[PDB]
Write an enzyme that holds these catalytic residues in place. Structure first.
Site, mmCIF file in Angstrom:
data_model
loop_
_atom_site.group_PDB
_atom_site.id
_atom_site.type_symbol
_atom_site.label_atom_id
_atom_site.label_comp_id
_atom_site.label_asym_id
_atom_site.label_seq_id
_atom_site.Cartn_x
_atom_site.Cartn_y
_atom_site.Cartn_z
ATOM 1 C CB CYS A 1 -9.905 0.926 -0.893
ATOM 2 S SG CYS A 1 -8.518 1.533 -1.888
ATOM 3 C CB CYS B 1 -2.375 -3.578 -3.141
ATOM 4 S SG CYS B 1 -3.859 -3.020 -3.938
ATOM 5 C CB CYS C 1 -2.281 6.064 0.492
ATOM 6 S SG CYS C 1 -3.472 4.781 1.049
ATOM 7 C CB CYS D 1 -4.636 -4.073 2.411
ATOM 8 S SG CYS D 1 -6.110 -2.986 2.385
ATOM 9 C CB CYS E 1 -0.933 0.012 1.206
ATOM 10 S SG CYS E 1 -2.297 1.189 1.033
HETATM 11 S S1 SF4 Z 1 -6.912 -1.952 -1.419
HETATM 12 FE FE1 SF4 Z 1 -6.528 0.306 -1.199
HETATM 13 S S2 SF4 Z 1 -5.762 0.611 0.945
HETATM 14 FE FE2 SF4 Z 1 -5.555 -1.625 0.431
HETATM 15 S S3 SF4 Z 1 -3.410 -1.872 -0.359
HETATM 16 FE FE3 SF4 Z 1 -4.748 -1.552 -2.202
HETATM 17 S S4 SF4 Z 1 -4.706 0.737 -2.560
HETATM 18 FE FE4 SF4 Z 1 -3.927 0.420 -0.429
#
Ligand code: SF4
Ligand code: FES
EC number: 1.8.7.2
Lengths: 73, 108, 96
Positions: B78, B67, B50, B69, B48
């Protein structure tokens, strides 16, 4: 909250990966299981998981929870 | 970047598999895919983007934040705003994103 | 009850003995191989592979669609060997 304790889902927790409810919302509240793990570190190194309490339930199904979501027994 | 295309192809297919949609502002979407590809090219796993970690090498091994996750697989949550429920306010009605729209993000 | 999994990676061939109750990826990691992965749950394509010979049980996967499943692609992190098989690793690229 130690690995092994049998917890109970007290808070309402909706999931979408349940084998009998694939892709559809399903509340786990009321289910009982045991803490398969308490994600905090990986071989000493620090881990940043926000849903540490991993609990395994009936057959092939487990799920992560926040502490206040589950209660000891 | 080859890895970029792979992360783009994933995001597109995953959104369709999980019935989720990209942000009504694709610029945000592109930024996440760009981060995922970056992390994947570095660690080997699309960790991830962010978020901040104190040991990315360990995180990737724990997989919790790889991801897609755990929060997203289990609760369709998310945090990067990459995958959104049609219900979500920030949700848009697109599940595909122009490669050009992505390339233009790498230019920064 | 174990089967022989003939893994074909970029670095070459390597045969391992995977139990019927053990995931291909896990079994491969026990042999000391370095296979790609991400979610480890069958929700992505990072561990994507391709069965050239044999069969596997990947009922636990959810990312791959019918067309891709019929083509021969599999998610090694949740695939169980259903018999002796030959699988090509690092095949995510060939997926799309
Ligand atoms: S689903 Fe969203 S929060 Fe989870 S790893 Fe992927 S981009 Fe990041
Ligand atoms: S690690 Fe994502 S499907 Fe196997």
């Amino acid at each position: 909250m130690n690995v092994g304790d049998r917890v109970r889902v007290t808070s309402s927790v909706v999931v979408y990966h349940h084998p009998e409810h694939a892709k559809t919302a399903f509340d786990l509240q009321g289910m009982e299981g045991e803490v398969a793990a308490v994600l905090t570190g990986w071989q000493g190194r620090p881990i940043s998981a926000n849903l540490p309490v991993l609990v395994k339930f009936e057959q092939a199904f487990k799920a992560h929870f926040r502490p206040d979501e589950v209660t000891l027994i | 970047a080859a890895t970029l295309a792979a992360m783009k192809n994933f995001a597109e297919q995953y959104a369709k598999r999980t019935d989720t949609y990209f942000c009504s502002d694709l610029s945000v979407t592109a930024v996440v895919i760009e981060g995922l590809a970056r992390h994947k090219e570095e660690l080997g796993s699309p960790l991830c983007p962010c978020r901040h970690y104190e040991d990315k090498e360990a995180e990737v091994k724990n997989t919790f934040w790889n991801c897609p996750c755990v929060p997203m697989r289990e609760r369709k949550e998310c945090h990067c705003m990459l995958f959104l429920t049609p219900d979500n306010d920030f949700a848009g009605d697109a599940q595909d994103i122009p490669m050009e729209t992505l390339e233009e993000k790498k230019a920064s | 009850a174990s089967y022989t999994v003939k893994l074909i990676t970029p670095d070459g061939e390597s045969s391992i003995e995977c139990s019927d109750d053990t995931y291909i990826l896990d079994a491969a990691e026990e042999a000391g191989l370095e296979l790609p992965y991400s979610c480890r749950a069958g929700a992505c394509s990072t561990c994507a592979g391709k069965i050239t010979a044999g069969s596997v049980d990947q009922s636990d996967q959810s990312f791959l669609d019918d067309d891709q499943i019929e083509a021969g692609y599999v998610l090694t992190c949740v695939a169980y060997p259903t018999s002796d098989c030959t699988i090509e690793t690092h095949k995510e690229e060939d997926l799309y």
